[PDB]
Design a protein around this ligand. Structure first.
Ligand SMILES: O=C(O)Cc1ccc([N+](=O)[O-])cc1
Ligand SMILES: [Ca+2]
Lengths: 206, 557
């Protein structure tokens, strides 16, 4: 069958999905996630979009403002709108699968609603593709591939320049925050290759 | 996050072994999610953070993959020129361009709603503005516009069957991440993935650049520039977030450096110690590195040279002799709360003193506080992440290497004094602090061990579980949030692949409304603490053989 999704769980509760097309496959995935980790997923969803203060109050308003200032939601929606039908099925199947279990949960809450929803006082809402994409953008791109301290580096550099003078402040800056250090242990041995680019280390842009 | 991949020429009783320990911190419920996907071109098994559509850790029976954080510099800040008159505009290539802007309302439970505006230029969202200089800073990411494609490259790569197909998808992943490869024939590979800017000449990537036009990136560097190796001459690939390659520049973070002192050397020594390794020995490297003090190796030679002409009754020297007898592996006593040897507490107090006398002294306040931590700072709940060598300590290591360090010592961090005098003074500070708390008999010093907490708050500081769901482990272990091992062509089985993992506390986070906890809520928690692991299944027969339940759905789109 093309309409059938079979879910087998192992001795540790780990789900295996058997399905024949993309949409059915990711629908199954979505569905077991909603069974296993619904409260965790809902708090992650609020965390990555900055909607925590709506269910947890005033201590989370700065958090929510910080999250929203660090991304541009329409740029994400435009990337989702350009996907081909096969790629769009991954995301749409997954949200549909979650939705199918959330519908049963919101219909049968006396036995199926995760206890923490009662504890924190709110209930799960339905997901769309945008929400699935934002789980990965928030907790992986926006947080683990976004590091810079360029502004604070400039404040240190300026403070070293005042202490040791202009040329000397720069060389101490290079002592504390070198660009490259040729003795660093590297995952690729020097006999295999080295990085070809060379960079300015004088702050030549001022 | 660490990774070791062992190929054909180093593997014993197998052709290839991959061990991965992604380090994200420790949480309840579990950071990652176990999942097997069988259909539409996919046949995979493994676990992945936040149940991503694509599996960050797993295999499809032919190849296996894993990740560690790349820390390349893929983000630069652009100083935009504003105008007091004509606000909402910024100068770019000789014209006054208007900003993108959007309004946001923060609804607040039991409070009033708050609305604010977000601003964006051609370089990116505006971080902060300086009205005084009429400058606004825009953070510009090289991956901007490729977030969704990176998610998809992590999904499609699960179908690759060889290096060529896998690197096609690696070339589309735009975030700074190391990717690793292993296969049934014993081939192994590594790619430092991501999109890196093609910067104009003279652009120093550690500091801001004017956003007026002339400093704009030229584009993105081609995938041929990304550091990558296939079937390395050494026979193995090891990483612990250290540099990918000779001359590759690191993130611009002031607290992050790739220098001569690096924790990956701890993995290297163990993999070079034996000519070949079995899967059991590859897995055992998790237990040794978990427990290894990272500073002993670095500063023991300096301590030994400094106290060499001291008498046996000089306490400074007694401190160095205790360190010389130690292999640096921390082990708990029987009480479950103190370490068996006082080495880490000694290095901690020594290093704090040495930093305060050298690096900290050369830097103006308030920047001196960036360089004072010894790397042992924790609280009662323990570290929130991996233990590393602190920045201050990496800078001090270069200084104690003298003219053997490639880094010009523009200021002498020892301020005219012979090194040994500064080392001995710090050692006197150490003896004074520790003997006052523990007494003079070094052999009965019972110093406090670090513990490990599975937090109910996720990594942002937001609750994802009730506070009582927090779990405590007596021994802190410097190891991945989950560990997974894949063994290809085992001589000891008829199966072409064997894989294991451990996802603690368990697969499920479900608690019924009556307070009844799921059966798989915590069945992996003790396994985690003792370095155990569970089998990952991939084939239909193995899944059927270990089935505990089945659910069938009939749905049409
Ligand atoms: O190591 C880190 O500090 C964060 C991290 C951990 C793992 C990872 N990964 O892609 O496995 C990415 C980031
Ligand atoms: Ca930068």
């Amino acid at each position: 069958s093309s309409s059938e999704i079979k879910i087998v769980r192992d001795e540790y509760g780990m789900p295996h999905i058997y399905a024949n097309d993309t949409w059915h496959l990711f629908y199954g995935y979505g569905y077991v996630v909603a069974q296993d980790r619904l409260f965790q997923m809902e708090m992650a969803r609020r965390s990555t979009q900055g909607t925590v203060a709506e269910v947890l109050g005033k201590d989370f308003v700065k958090f929510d403002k910080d999250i929203r200032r660090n991304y541009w939601p329409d740029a994400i929606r435009a990337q989702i709108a350009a996907l081909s039908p096969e790629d769009m099925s991954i995301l749409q199947g997954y949200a549909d699968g979650m939705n199918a279990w959330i519908d049963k949960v919101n219909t049968n809450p006396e036995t199926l609603l995760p206890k923490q929803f009662n504890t924190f006082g709110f209930t799960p809402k339905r997901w769309e593709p945008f929400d699935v994409a934002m789980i990965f953008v928030g907790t992986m791109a926006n947080r683990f591939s976004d590091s810079t301290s360029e502004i604070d580096n400039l404040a240190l550099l300026t403070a070293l320049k005042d202490k040791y003078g202009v040329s000397q402040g720069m060389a101490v800056f290079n002592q504390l925050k070198w660009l490259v250090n040729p003795s660093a242990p590297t995952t690729i041995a020097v006999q295999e290759s080295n990085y070809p680019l060379k960079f300015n280390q004088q702050n030549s842009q001022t | 996050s660490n990774m070791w991949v062992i190929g054909k020429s180093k593997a014993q009783d197998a052709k290839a072994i991959m061990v991965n320990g992604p380090q994200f911190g420790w949480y309840a419920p579990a950071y990652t999610y176990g999942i097997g996907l069988h259909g539409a071109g996919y046949d995979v098994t493994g676990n992945t953070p936040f149940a991503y559509p694509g599996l960050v850790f797993g295999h499809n029976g032919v190849i296996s993959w894993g990740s560690t954080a790349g820390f390349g510099d893929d983000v630069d800040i652009f100083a935009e020129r504003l105008s007091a008159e004509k606000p909402g505009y910024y100068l770019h290539n000789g014209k006054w361009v208007k900003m993108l802007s959007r309004e946001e309302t923060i609804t607040v439970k039991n409070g009033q709603a708050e609305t604010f505006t977000v601003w964006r230029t051609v370089h990116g969202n505006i971080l902060q503005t300086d009205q005084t200089t009429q400058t606004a800073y825009a953070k510009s990411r090289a991956w901007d516009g490729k977030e969704v494609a990176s998610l998809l490259a992590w999904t499609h790569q699960m179908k690759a069957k060889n290096w060529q197909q896998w690197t096609q998808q690696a070339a589309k992943q735009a975030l700074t991440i190391n990717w690793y490869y292993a296969d049934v024939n014993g081939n192994i590979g590594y790619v430092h993935t991501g999109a890196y800017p093609d910067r104009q000449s003279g652009h120093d990537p550690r500091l801001p650049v004017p956003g007026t036009g002339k400093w704009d990136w030229k584009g993105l560097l081609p995938f041929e520039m990304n550091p990558k190796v296939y079937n390395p001459q050494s026979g193995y690939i090891a990483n612990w977030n250290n540099s990918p390659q000779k001359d590759y520049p690191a993130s611009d973070l002031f607290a992050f450096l790739w220098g001569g002192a690096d924790r990956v050397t701890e993995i290297d020594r163990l993999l070079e110690q034996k000519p070949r390794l079995t899967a059991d020995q590859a897995w055992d490297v998790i237990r040794q590195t978990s427990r290894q003090d990272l500073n002993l190796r670095l500063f023991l030679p300096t301590l030994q040279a400094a106290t060499s002409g001291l008498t046996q009754s000089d306490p400074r020297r007694q401190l160095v002799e205790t360190l010389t007898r130690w292999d640096g592996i921390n082990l708990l006593n029987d009480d479950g709360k103190t370490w068996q040897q006082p080495g880490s507490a000694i290095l901690n107090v020594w290093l704090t003193s040495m930093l305060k006398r050298t690096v900290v002294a050369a830097v103006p306040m308030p920047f001196d506080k960036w360089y004072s931590a010894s790397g042992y700072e924790t609280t009662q709940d323990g570290p929130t992440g991996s233990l590393n060598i602190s920045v201050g300590a990496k800078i001090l290591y270069e200084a104690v290497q003298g003219d053997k360090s490639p880094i010009p010592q523009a200021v002498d961090l020892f301020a005219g004094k012979p090194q040994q005098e500064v080392v001995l003074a710090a050692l006197e500070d150490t003896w004074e602090t520790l003997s006052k708390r523990y007494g003079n008999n070094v052999s009965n010093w019972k110093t406090p061990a670090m513990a490990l907490t599975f937090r109910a708050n996720n990594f942002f500081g937001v609750p994802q579980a009730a506070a009582e769901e927090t779990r405590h482990q007596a021994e802190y272990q410097n190891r991945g949030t989950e560990n997974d091992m894949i063994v290809f062509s085992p001589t000891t089985s008829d199966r072409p692949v064997l894989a294991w993992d451990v996802v603690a506390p368990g697969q499920s986070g479900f608690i019924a409304p009556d307070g009844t906890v799921d059966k798989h809520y915590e069945d992996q928690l003790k396994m985690y603490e003792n370095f155990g692991r569970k089998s990952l299944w991939l084939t239909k027969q193995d899944v059927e053989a270990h089935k505990e339940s089945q659910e069938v759905l009939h749905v049409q789109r």
